[PDB]
Design a protein around this ligand. Structure first.
Ligand SMILES: COc1nc(-c2ccnc(NC(=O)C3CC3)c2)ncc1C(N)=O
Length: 333
């Protein structure tokens, strides 16, 4: 019925408090453990609780990363507590994901309206700009990790179980990231990759939202590679070095359906690039013309509501390229 724990607030100083929740139901199982949904007794607010076995030999990386994140497009750590000992992350509950929503449209043989593609992708790139400004790479960007509130069109990035700060010259494991969304340098087993792998994944999500299906499917690395090559063409010797069947590149305009906005395709082509340093940074993507509509003072949601927070950039968020502020923050913001 009612569970009462002593939990430490996610943000702010380490001062624990009694927190009572109820209506606990399971909403997900995984390699990490279990995600519950519960209701806070004090406020009626819905939370997700992610339960993981605690390393005991060290501090939990996910927890350390989440306690220092504060951004409106990243799911909020409200509390954490301990309960073989387990670490429980209490997060704001979000009712949907890009995965289930994309699933709804594909099953109905429709595509998600481009206005939602713009809103969702833009917010994803902001969450990335934010975590990348700390040197933190998410390393598992995929539709199941993109939470959505369909009423307000707010997107929140979740799951920082793979996230890690990438320091130049330090090797990192290549076996991160989920099939379909893996950068080609990961497939090739590179251990010197950069945060731009997040950008490649984000481009895969964009292409999927436009196509109604994954752009580079395959149950093996070789199949994925074959699909990437069918689109990008055969990588050059130099492109390979930066990260085989000789195939000529398929014109990007012929990859998507006829009614697809050319700005959407141009954005795709600048995200999905062999050479990791040639991909757009998240902040640059935010500033891409594909998102200009979002910066239009007259824009509204299909449901009639105002757009959610889009322009509340901080100095930290802009730090990779401060003069983009002039594009990113429109006159009416
Ligand atoms: C399913 O895995 C996860 N799920 C969440 C989460 C957080 C807040 N709201 C939701 N909401 C939903 O799942 C609704 C049902 C679609 C999920 N957070 C982290 C993880 C993780 N694996 O780290």
């Amino acid at each position: 019925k009612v569970t009462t724990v002593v939990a430490t607030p996610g943000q702010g100083p380490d001062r624990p408090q009694e927190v009572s929740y109820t209506d606990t139901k399971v909403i997900g199982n995984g390699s990490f453990g279990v995600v519950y949904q519960a209701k806070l007794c004090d406020s009626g607010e819905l939370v997700a609780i992610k339960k993981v076995l605690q390393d005991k030999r060290f501090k939990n990386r996910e927890l350390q990363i989440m306690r220092k994140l504060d951004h409106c497009n990243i799911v909020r750590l409200r509390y954490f507590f301990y309960s073989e000992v387990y670490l429980n992350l209490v997060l704001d509950y979000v009712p949907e994901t890009v995965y289930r929503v994309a699933r709804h449209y594909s099953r109905a043989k429709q595509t998600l309206p481009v206005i939602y593609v713009k809103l969702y992708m833009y917010q994803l790139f902001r969450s990335l700009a934010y975590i990348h400004s700390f040197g933190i790479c998410h390393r598992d960007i995929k539709p199941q990790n993109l939470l959505l509130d369909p009423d307000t069109a707010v997107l929140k990035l979740c799951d920082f179980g793979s996230a890690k700060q990438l320091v130049r010259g330090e090797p990192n494991v290549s076996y991160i990231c989920s099939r379909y969304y893996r950068a080609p340098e990961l497939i090739f087993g590179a251990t010197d990759y950069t945060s731009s792998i997040d950008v490649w994944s984000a481009g895969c999500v964009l292409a999927e939202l436009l196509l109604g299906q994954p752009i580079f499917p395959g149950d093996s690395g070789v199949d994925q590679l074959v699909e990437i090559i069918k689109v990008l063409g055969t990588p050059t010797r130099e492109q390979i070095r930066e990260m085989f069947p000789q195939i000529k590149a398929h014109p990007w305009t012929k990859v998507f359906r006829p009614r697809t906005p050319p700005e959407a395709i141009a954005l795709c082509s600048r995200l999905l690039e062999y050479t990791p340093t040639a991909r757009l940074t998240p902040l640059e993507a935010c500033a891409h013309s594909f998102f200009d509509e979002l910066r239009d003072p007259n824009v509204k949601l299909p449901n009639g509501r105002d757009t959610p927070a889009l322009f509340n950039f901080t100095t930290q968020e802009l730090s990779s390229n401060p003069p983009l502020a002039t594009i990113l923050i429109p006159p009416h913001a």
